[PDB]
Design a protein around this ligand. Structure first.
Ligand SMILES: CC(=O)N[C@H]1[C@@H](OP(=O)(O)OP(=O)(O)OC[C@H]2O[C@@H](n3ccc(=O)[nH]c3=O)[C@H](O)[C@@H]2O)O[C@H](CO)[C@@H](O)[C@@H]1O
Ligand SMILES: CC(=O)N[C@H]1[C@@H](OP(=O)(O)OP(=O)(O)OC[C@H]2O[C@@H](n3ccc(=O)[nH]c3=O)[C@H](O)[C@@H]2O)O[C@H](CO)[C@@H](O)[C@@H]1O
Ligand SMILES: O=c1ccn([C@@H]2O[C@H](COP(=O)(O)OP(=O)(O)O)[C@@H](O)[C@H]2O)c(=O)[nH]1
Ligand SMILES: O=c1ccn([C@@H]2O[C@H](COP(=O)(O)OP(=O)(O)O)[C@@H](O)[C@H]2O)c(=O)[nH]1
Lengths: 376, 384
């Protein structure tokens, strides 16, 4: 009989990383696959689904404006529970570390449905950084039957938590599957036109634990850089969270050389990253994409769960102190040795074959294939 | 300033095990303590609160008839979330492995409130046995800042999961704090009067994974034993779950020698256990109580997370197969050597001072005491 697989996800980053897997799953005659979105994000999720031309089988439309963690958890849980009364897949695949990831896993567990965790095992060891992502991924790890770890270090993290080695596979990150298709040699954009010959710093900031004072500190450091370096401009595709938007407007409204724009489609964003001089970000996904692009990243966090990019020299933790961020950005602008150190391209997160590996592992595990795939 | 401590629980077993801790907390002028119940159980919770004379500060009244896991989780989370908007304790203490335990921990975490886990670290390694308790305690363990493990092996379970040693304390189980006060010399009850001279088997059965076929298999075996042995009577205080009640009525409804009764108050239940010939149960708490009483227990499960009781000879895993349960119960009724092997009293789960250790650990952690209390000492450490 055909293996019944359901992907469950709800946000921009999950959708970008899950879309290559959703498309891979469809290529296999022995799999009957379903796509379920919680729509924890609405506009930002639809931007991705539309770009990949993916239409979900089920769309739970849960997003509320300025929603709380309790609200997302309850809404996702209740709606998925209702879904699972009628449709019973053999396995539910969740992604990464959102509240949708955890609620999806929990709803599946409550119906005794098996769970596979895509992007399993990332850790900072700090329950409040990132908040609540660190616990979302740890609690999802308690539920998951199969763990698709992007890297060996992620697998080691799960081993240290007493997970069975034979339930964890090192696949690479599906983000690289997508990234390997988007960059364009001849790329053009109206915003890049007005940047012109100036150095471009690409900025995103949205971590929950960074809202308020930490983000004010980041933005003050950025204002100081722009004021001091005349040949520098910032492009900031601003997250739809109104708390972020308030902070962005407060600091960068009336700035000629900081461009506040709507979130970019992923092909556009990847191409902006490729064109950037360097990146300031607190994004998870951007940290995994940057090494492939050989693009220096100052990570505006006190922690990271991407140590592989740090080892490659691409990623440097800058924290959230104003002066520290200023000094690190100034260094990248004025020290060619430091810039060179941070701008060597490598592929520590994937080779573009992660989706294939995940599906082939599923097929092996359930007895459809006699052989296991290669590891990343 | 006073340390603000809130206990959060909602079911019969949590209330029994948390009651001694609630009362212990009230003793210390250093602590401002609050009691919050979800009332995941209504009647069965109220029975415990009334017995211990505990009046909750907050009662969320969540119980619905035939409620699902998703329902309990959502209702508890939403109501606790609302509570924490208004009241911010320094630490929330949750108990054990119920959906209330997990939802309480999660709600506290969402408000960045510290969590202490009473009865931390119990494991079967099987996510469907017990269901959902194994995962409830595992996920609670991910959230908890402090882990109050009843025994050394529970601490070892947490260490194996990469929990830091300095965050785990071995306290004994608070169940023993309660048990040490309840058994009295000349206990009597109208139901025991009916039993008279006969051997009494005390039965409870309610595990979620046992509902339906497994429980019917248990009950078929038990009905056979009652039929075959005329001097045996069963006392069964039946859980309020309608699903359990249907099965109890189906298999025992016509038997004069199976007493189907309402859930007993804890004082009465403990005294019935003390007077029983042996116990048939799938209860967690009864497994911890029985060694103290030297009472053989056939555990009606395919797993247990009380291995200390198994090693003591008190607990024997019987599974849920009809014939196996019948054979093992028949053995206890007919084999004096086997009965003797299972009826040696010991105290592997506590010495009655668990609640005090928990409170003193809290006071040390937060700087109110210069000294840390000694851990509960087990098995091997006595003797070696
Ligand atoms: C706990 C959790 O799961 N957080 C994830 C969520 O954080 P994020 O900060 O996006 O949190 P939410 O998904 O709750 O969205 C926050 C708020 O932003 C607004 N909003 C968001 C999306 C949208 O399409 N339209 C819109 O209006 C809404 O007011 C919403 O309530 O998404 C991020 C991706 O960007 C992930 O990195 C985070 O791990
Ligand atoms: C997942 C979870 O947390 N399960 C716990 C719960 O299981 P338990 O089997 O009691 O599950 P519930 O707490 O959901 O109660 C089930 C149903 O029983 C009925 N009911 C229950 C209590 C009551 O006072 N009145 C009443 O009418 C209701 O119809 C209720 O919906 O309590 C048991 C103690 O007995 C614990 O061992 C279990 O760990
Ligand atoms: O304007 C943007 C900003 C980011 N991204 C992509 O979104 C993903 C990261 O999502 P986000 O930073 O929202 O969440 P996180 O990764 O931190 O969970 C990465 O693939 C980015 O390339 C995008 O397509 N457009
Ligand atoms: O009729 C009864 C049955 C049990 N108990 C007590 O209830 C606790 C265990 O609760 P339960 O079996 O409902 O749940 P579990 O321990 O399996 O979570 C133990 O302290 C028992 O002594 C009780 O007081 N009256």
């Amino acid at each position: 009989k055909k293996l019944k697989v359901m992907t469950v996800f709800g946000t921009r980053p999950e959708a970008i990383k899950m879309a290559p897997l959703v498309l891979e799953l469809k290529k296999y005659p022995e799999i009957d696959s379903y796509v379920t979105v919680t729509a924890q994000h609405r506009q930002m999720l639809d931007q991705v689904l539309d770009a990949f031309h993916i239409k979900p089988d089920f769309d739970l439309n849960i997003m509320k404006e300025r929603q709380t963690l309790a609200e997302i958890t309850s809404n996702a849980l209740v709606r998925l529970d209702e879904l699972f009364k009628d449709i019973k897949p053999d396995i539910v695949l969740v992604h990464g570390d959102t509240t949708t990831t955890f609620a999806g896993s929990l709803a599946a567990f409550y119906h005794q449905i098996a769970v596979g965790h895509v992007e399993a095992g990332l850790r900072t060891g700090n329950k409040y950084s990132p908040f609540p992502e660190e616990l979302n991924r740890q609690m999802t790890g308690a539920i998951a039957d199969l763990h698709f770890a992007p890297t060996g270090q992620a697998k080691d993290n799960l081993l240290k938590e007493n997970k069975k080695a034979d339930s964890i596979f090192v696949t690479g990150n599906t983000a690289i599957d997508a990234l390997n298709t988007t960059v364009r040699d001849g790329y053009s954009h109206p915003v890049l036109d007005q940047v012109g010959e100036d150095k471009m710093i690409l900025l995103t900031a949205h971590r929950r634990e960074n809202l308020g004072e930490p983000m004010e500190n980041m933005f003050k450091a950025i204002r100081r850089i722009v004021g001091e370096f005349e040949d520098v401009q910032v492009v900031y595709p601003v997250h739809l969270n109104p708390v972020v938007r308030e902070a962005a407007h407060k600091h960068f409204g009336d700035s000629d050389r900081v461009h506040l724009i709507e979130p970019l489609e992923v092909i556009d964003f990847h191409n902006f990253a490729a064109k950037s001089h360097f990146i300031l970000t607190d994004s998870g996904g951007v940290q995994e994409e940057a090494p492939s692009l050989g693009k220096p990243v100052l990570v505006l966090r006190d922690t990271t769960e991407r140590p592989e990019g740090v080892e490659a020299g691409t990623l440097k933790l800058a924290g959230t102190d104003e002066e520290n961020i200023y000094q690190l950005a100034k260094q990248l602008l004025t020290d060619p040795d430091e810039y060179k150190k941070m701008s060597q391209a490598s592929n520590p997160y994937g080779d573009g074959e992660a989706s294939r590996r995940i599906v082939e592992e599923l097929l092996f595990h359930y007895g459809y294939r006699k052989e296991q795939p290669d590891s990343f």
